[PDB]
Symmetry: C2
Subunit: 66 residues, 2 copies
């Protein structure tokens, strides 16, 4: 037997993916930080700070808001 | 000004990527769970669970600590 499950709580509300095999996806969410799976979080040092994750993934994280 | 930093504690010891551009990478670590960035963690239901992250990423997470305390 086996299970397939997420071991992350990272989430993305606006995930955009190329329509390709395989897909190239990114999370376009902006906030005061990035989600807990983000390797490359870029933040403008404004007040409030504005951060977005620049990682490219082959899938989308679950929605934060649904 | 701006800052580029990780907001994850996920790590991967055995990251394998294509050499073509842009890269396609996966983490081949096997353990009792998967790292904290894994969307698709597949685990055998063996007593010692054996789990691996199936996600494809366009990058590698940083290597894990050399100690037992690692993500």
């Amino acid at each position: 037997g086996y299970k397939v499950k997420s071991t992350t709580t990272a989430c993305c509300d606006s995930c955009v993916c190329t329509k390709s095999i395989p897909p190239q996806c990114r999370c376009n969410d902006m906030g005061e930080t990035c989600h807990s799976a983000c390797k490359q979080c870029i933040c403008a040092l404004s007040y409030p700070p504005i951060c977005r994750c620049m990682d490219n993934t082959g899938f989308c994280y679950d929605s934060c808001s649904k």
